[PDB]
Design a protein around this ligand. Structure first.
Ligand code: MET
Ligand SMILES: [K+]
Ligand SMILES: [K+]
Ligand SMILES: [K+]
Ligand SMILES: [K+]
Ligand SMILES: [K+]
Ligand SMILES: [K+]
Ligand SMILES: [K+]
Ligand SMILES: [K+]
Ligand SMILES: [K+]
Ligand SMILES: [K+]
Ligand SMILES: [K+]
Ligand SMILES: [Mg+2]
Ligand SMILES: [Mg+2]
Ligand SMILES: [Mg+2]
Ligand SMILES: [Mg+2]
Ligand SMILES: [Mg+2]
Ligand SMILES: [Mg+2]
Ligand SMILES: [Mg+2]
Ligand SMILES: [Mg+2]
Ligand SMILES: [Mg+2]
Ligand SMILES: [Mg+2]
Ligand SMILES: [Mg+2]
Ligand SMILES: [Mg+2]
Ligand SMILES: [Mg+2]
Ligand SMILES: [Mg+2]
Ligand SMILES: [Mg+2]
Ligand SMILES: [Mg+2]
Ligand SMILES: [Mg+2]
Ligand SMILES: [Mg+2]
Ligand SMILES: [Mg+2]
Ligand SMILES: [Mg+2]
Ligand SMILES: [Mg+2]
Ligand SMILES: [Mg+2]
Ligand SMILES: [Mg+2]
Ligand SMILES: [Mg+2]
Ligand SMILES: [Mg+2]
Ligand SMILES: [Mg+2]
Ligand SMILES: [Mg+2]
Ligand SMILES: [Mg+2]
Ligand SMILES: [Mg+2]
Ligand SMILES: [Mg+2]
Ligand SMILES: [Mg+2]
Ligand SMILES: [Mg+2]
Ligand SMILES: [Mg+2]
Ligand SMILES: [Mg+2]
Ligand SMILES: [Mg+2]
Ligand SMILES: [Mg+2]
Ligand SMILES: [Mg+2]
Ligand SMILES: [Mg+2]
Ligand SMILES: [Mg+2]
Ligand SMILES: [Mg+2]
Ligand SMILES: [Mg+2]
Ligand SMILES: [Mg+2]
Ligand SMILES: [Mg+2]
Ligand SMILES: [Mg+2]
Ligand SMILES: [Mg+2]
Ligand SMILES: [Mg+2]
Ligand SMILES: [Mg+2]
Ligand SMILES: [Mg+2]
Ligand SMILES: [Mg+2]
Ligand SMILES: [Mg+2]
Ligand SMILES: [Mg+2]
Ligand SMILES: [Mg+2]
Ligand SMILES: [Mg+2]
Ligand SMILES: [Mg+2]
Ligand SMILES: [Mg+2]
Ligand SMILES: [Mg+2]
Ligand SMILES: [Mg+2]
Ligand SMILES: [Mg+2]
Ligand SMILES: [Mg+2]
Ligand SMILES: [Mg+2]
Ligand SMILES: [Mg+2]
Ligand SMILES: [Mg+2]
Ligand SMILES: [Mg+2]
Ligand SMILES: [Mg+2]
Ligand SMILES: [Mg+2]
Ligand SMILES: [Mg+2]
Ligand SMILES: [Mg+2]
Ligand SMILES: [Mg+2]
Ligand SMILES: [Mg+2]
Ligand SMILES: [Mg+2]
Ligand SMILES: [Mg+2]
Ligand SMILES: [Mg+2]
Ligand SMILES: [Mg+2]
Lengths: 381, 70
RNA sequence: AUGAGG
RNA sequence: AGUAAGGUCAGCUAAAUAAGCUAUCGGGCCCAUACCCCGAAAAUGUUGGUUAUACCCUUCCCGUACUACCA
RNA sequence: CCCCACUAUGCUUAGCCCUAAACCUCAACAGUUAAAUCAACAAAACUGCUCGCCAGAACACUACGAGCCACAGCUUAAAACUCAAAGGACCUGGCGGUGCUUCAUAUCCCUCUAGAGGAGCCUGUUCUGUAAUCGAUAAACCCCGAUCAACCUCACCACCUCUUGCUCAGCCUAUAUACCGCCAUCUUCAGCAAACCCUGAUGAAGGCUACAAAGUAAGCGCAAGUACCCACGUAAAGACGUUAGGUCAAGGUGUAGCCCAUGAGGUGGCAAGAAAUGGGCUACAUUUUCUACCCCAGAAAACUACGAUAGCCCUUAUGAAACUUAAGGGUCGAAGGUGGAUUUAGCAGUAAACUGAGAGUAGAGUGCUUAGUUGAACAGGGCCCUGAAGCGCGUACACACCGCCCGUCACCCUCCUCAAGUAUACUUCAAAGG
RNA sequence: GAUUAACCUUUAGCAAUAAACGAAAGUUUAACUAAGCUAUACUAACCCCAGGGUUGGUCAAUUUCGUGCCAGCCACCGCGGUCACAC
RNA sequence: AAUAGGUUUGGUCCUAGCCUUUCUAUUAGCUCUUAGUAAGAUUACACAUGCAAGCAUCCCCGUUCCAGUGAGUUCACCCUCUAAAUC
């Protein structure tokens, strides 16, 4: 439980450091004259540590009451213990319920947030090539239907993009778009390779009633935004120079060629095909707009690629996240060691599937807390 | 006996001929380069003979022929 | 014409 | 910057009774799939005007095409 | 691949090219038929002597070097990386768009009779839908578990309630891929096989000739008996095995899981149709429709005909409960005008048509089981098509043709080669001369 | 010191032997002799003191759990997919 | 390659490779009690410091030996002839 995690010395030592740091900031802001630039940094740090210190102080007060409650019981007399101990137990249970919430509240506060909370997801499912028959392709159809039904359960809009059926009533590859609130947060853990172990019943592989292992790949990606290019004239440097080529005396005195340099990007576009500078300028703008249109597309794609590279995270592209064992009627998630019964209900994408995702969120938050304490352990030493 | 051994050589030979046909001009230039170096190396070997024997130049009336030609 | 996987 | 010309079943063409083929759906054939067989469904870029409409004109839009020369 | 037209080429002269499954894959000469003849197969086994050649597979009839009238060539011929096999010859089985021969009797084709696929309705299933079962789900699922669901059944759903609980607990929770039980299927088959003997040089394996040549065989199945109306027919029977065939939901049980519940009780609710489909029923009528009759009749006979067992309304039966189940009446008179590709069944009291009864229920099916009546047509050819048997042939299949397997593109990895230029490093000079 | 998978003391004596020198008594010698360090090897011993590897077959030898084609093992053949003599 | 063994396949027979089993030497892991003896940088890469050749009536002699290394490499052995050296 969460109580054992708080009992670990690493968390207790780190929480004391924050409390000491929180008190140190308060003293500096009140007695020591601080520069305006440095005062704001302390205020922001003090504000960030304010919810952490307040919860920690409540936890300390909660723990002290437990010691006081136990100390009072030890001094009681057996002639009047029966009535008072019953009241003491009720108070202790009430405090223990409160201290668990404080542990939960403190644990949740340490957890940071995610950039892609609400961005739409373009989900893709592909039948992995791992064994003979259509088991891999037949299983892909079930998974694709599970996500489609799960969208309805969460009231999410499911827009079909690509759908290539197999030759035996299965799916080779399918792509779809899901829109809603918190789509990426719930569906980010679903990316990976799924394993299915079942005896075929319907399909080409049903000719041999022997257990077969199949795999398929699920790809979860966020949806980007539109690409609109607006060229501010302040960021554009316009240079006029004489053109090159055999054009008699007109070129020698008229600066027809136009060179456009985009200061933020450094791209240089030159046009001299037309005789008139104005005619060249519009075309040179058009080439610059098209070239910078690709740059913004490259800008958008590169930003998304580097959005999560900063965070230390695993490459969730090829890994056996879950195992679907129809033989024993148990869906096992190896990441969190969570097993779900009634696979038939599980594949319906309803209450059962949501519980597994909720367990993933609960376990992932617990892992995030542990990493921060280990990260703060090195800084404390 | 089955022709399994012959079939393997049949496919290897067939793919080799298509590969040769596909890049017969690339190999032509490589062969051209090697023939020029072959003649130069041959000329060096003859040149070493008279230099090591004390002759400053080749014997009068002598000229190394281009043996590698068409 | 094609099909077989633990 | 000018001018020409094209916009038609999902797709591609033919005709302006808006058809054929593929695709598509349903059935049969086959242990199954495909081929195959039977049957069904499916469209005039858009605007307005052309007795009234369509193949026309025209409004608008997408794409295509040629020209932009001499000192 | 088949057909037609035509060129290089096949011919001649001269000069090239120097390859082949250039293989009789079996070296030249001199011998032998004796011993141990001899892995197998093929074309019996060896001696003397000499020459050529070979040392795991693949890379490789390749790279580089070299030689060549060769220049997309030939000859000679590697290495790194990779694999634990590759290969030769067989055994048995399967399979063959494999040969010959003989056949199939509701059966393969031709043929024979009535149907299905079209319509309405009834009833299943797939999909979709719903808070709302499960199983069957090519032949061998689809009026299937059900000789049956308004409540109950019930295992499902929502809500509520109980905790040593009807049980010296329980679970219709998972696993039919642990099983018993009871079956499907080849089977509309005739084979399976203990214990011995023999053959192949004492190998996987094989075992027959009747004017007979190594087979003998308990047991099982077929057969024989028995049931029904005969000795006929129909039932029944139908081995070993095949499909990890069906059934943890008849029951029981192995393993694993649940025990404030994945268990138990009560209330209410679910069972629908966008669409598609299987089976069946009733029809599209004149060999019919209605009535009388149970076979000498009178009418009807196209928008008031034929045709709903559907809809609506009413009544009645059962029940505590009926818009829901059934029967009856009224009203209504729809689609349907003999059905596309395709497909099922039947060899005689059979098909077809018609009429009863029974199982099960309080009631409830156009379903299932069963008795009786009227009562046919074709049955002759053929091996063309499909399949079976006998004797052969082939086989790179053995998970056994639903087998196996080949190459390009795309994908990833390793190693190597080639390559303009450049850089770095190494080697050589005096072993000479004035 | 660097480098490499490779890692011995910044001791003692000319007493023995060998070498150099002298006629000789003798002298010099990191040669050598006698020690120091180290399971590399051999031999021997020890009241108390034993570790390392392996245990599917080849090939001597596994109980109970955990794990569930995952983590991992193997010289060759291979084992691991919720009854593992192979982790 | 032996007294051999495992492994090609549905299976047999033949051929064949790879591997196992035996004996040493280094290095690594883990582990380590004594005594005696034997042996001992990976590198022809760079080296702080000390020492390793003196003797002796002066001249001579010795320091060309011993010790070390394995870079290079058919100068090593037999025969003929014949310096130096010892007697
Ligand atoms: C422009 O080019 C005009 N001056 C002509 C020059 S050549 C005669
Ligand atoms: K055979
Ligand atoms: K019909
Ligand atoms: K029907
Ligand atoms: K009820
Ligand atoms: K059970
Ligand atoms: K196979
Ligand atoms: K001495
Ligand atoms: K050691
Ligand atoms: K061997
Ligand atoms: K002296
Ligand atoms: K050396
Ligand atoms: Mg099964
Ligand atoms: Mg043959
Ligand atoms: Mg090849
Ligand atoms: Mg294909
Ligand atoms: Mg179709
Ligand atoms: Mg000719
Ligand atoms: Mg010939
Ligand atoms: Mg030959
Ligand atoms: Mg000869
Ligand atoms: Mg002869
Ligand atoms: Mg023989
Ligand atoms: Mg050749
Ligand atoms: Mg060649
Ligand atoms: Mg070479
Ligand atoms: Mg060459
Ligand atoms: Mg030759
Ligand atoms: Mg056959
Ligand atoms: Mg046959
Ligand atoms: Mg029949
Ligand atoms: Mg019908
Ligand atoms: Mg079940
Ligand atoms: Mg059902
Ligand atoms: Mg099922
Ligand atoms: Mg029913
Ligand atoms: Mg009910
Ligand atoms: Mg229950
Ligand atoms: Mg039970
Ligand atoms: Mg079974
Ligand atoms: Mg089943
Ligand atoms: Mg014998
Ligand atoms: Mg036998
Ligand atoms: Mg018998
Ligand atoms: Mg009889
Ligand atoms: Mg029977
Ligand atoms: Mg019988
Ligand atoms: Mg079946
Ligand atoms: Mg049971
Ligand atoms: Mg049970
Ligand atoms: Mg049990
Ligand atoms: Mg319950
Ligand atoms: Mg209940
Ligand atoms: Mg039926
Ligand atoms: Mg009637
Ligand atoms: Mg009625
Ligand atoms: Mg009543
Ligand atoms: Mg009624
Ligand atoms: Mg009427
Ligand atoms: Mg017809
Ligand atoms: Mg009845
Ligand atoms: Mg009754
Ligand atoms: Mg019914
Ligand atoms: Mg095939
Ligand atoms: Mg590509
Ligand atoms: Mg090179
Ligand atoms: Mg050492
Ligand atoms: Mg002395
Ligand atoms: Mg010593
Ligand atoms: Mg081990
Ligand atoms: Mg292997
Ligand atoms: Mg275990
Ligand atoms: Mg072992
Ligand atoms: Mg172990
Ligand atoms: Mg052997
Ligand atoms: Mg082999
Ligand atoms: Mg074989
Ligand atoms: Mg094997
Ligand atoms: Mg076997
Ligand atoms: Mg060998
Ligand atoms: Mg000294
Ligand atoms: Mg020496
Ligand atoms: Mg030394
Ligand atoms: Mg060396
Ligand atoms: Mg002399």
């Amino acid at each position: 439980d969460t109580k054992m995690l708080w009992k670990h010395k690493a968390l207790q030592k780190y929480m004391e450091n924050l409390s000491k740091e929180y008190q140190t900031l308060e003293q500096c802001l009140q007695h020591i004259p601080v520069n305006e630039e440095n005062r704001r940094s302390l205020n922001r740090r003090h504000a960030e540590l304010a919810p952490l210190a307040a919860i920690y102080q409540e936890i300390q007060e909660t723990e002290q009451a437990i010691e006081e409650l136990e100390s009072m019981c030890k001094s009681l007399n057996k002639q009047d213990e029966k009535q008072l101990q019953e009241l003491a137990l009720e108070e202790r249970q009430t405090i223990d319920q409160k201290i668990n919430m404080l542990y939960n509240e403190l644990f949740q506060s340490l957890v940071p947030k995610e950039k892609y909370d609400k961005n739409d997801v373009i989900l893709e499912v592909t039948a992995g090539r791992t064994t003979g028959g259509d088991i891999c392709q037949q299983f892909t159809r079930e998974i694709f239907d599970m996500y489609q039904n799960y969208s309805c359960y969460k009231h999410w809009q499911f827009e079909l993009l690509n759908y290539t059926p197999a030759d035996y009533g299965g799916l080779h590859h399918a792509a779809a778009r899901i829109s809603g609130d918190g789509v990426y947060k719930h569906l980010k853990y679903e990316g990976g390779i799924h394993r299915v172990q079942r005896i075929p019943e319907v399909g080409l592989s049903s000719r041999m009633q022997r257990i077969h292992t199949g795999t398929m790949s699920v790809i979860v990606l966020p949806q980007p935004d539109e690409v609109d290019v607006k060229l501010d004239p302040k960021d554009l440097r316009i240079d006029t120079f004489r053109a090159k080529g055999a054009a008699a005396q007109h070129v020698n005195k008229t600066d027809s060629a136009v060179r456009l340099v985009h200061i933020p990007t450094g791209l240089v576009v030159e046009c001299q095909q037309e005789r008139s500078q104005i005619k060249n300028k519009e075309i040179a703008f058009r080439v610059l707009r098209a070239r910078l249109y690709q740059q913004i597309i490259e800008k958008d794609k590169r930003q998304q690629q580097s959005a999560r590279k900063l965070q230390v995270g695993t490459r969730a592209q090829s890994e056996r996240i879950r195992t679907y064992n129809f033989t024993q009627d148990r869906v096992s998630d190896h990441r969190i060691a969570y097993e779900v019964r009634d696979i038939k209900e599980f594949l319906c994408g309803g209450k059962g599937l949501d519980q597994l995702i909720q367990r993933l969120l609960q376990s992932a938050d617990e892992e995030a807390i542990a990493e921060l304490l280990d990260e703060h352990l090195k800084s404390a030493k | 006996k089955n022709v399994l051994k012959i079939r393997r050589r049949k496919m290897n030979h067939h793919k080799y001929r298509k590969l040769v046909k596909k890049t017969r001009f690339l190999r032509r230039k490589v062969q051209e380069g090697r023939l020029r170096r072959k003649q130069i190396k041959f000329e060096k070997d003859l040149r070493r003979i008279w230099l090591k024997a004390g002759l400053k130049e080749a014997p009068e009336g002598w000229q190394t022929p281009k043996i590698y030609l068409r």
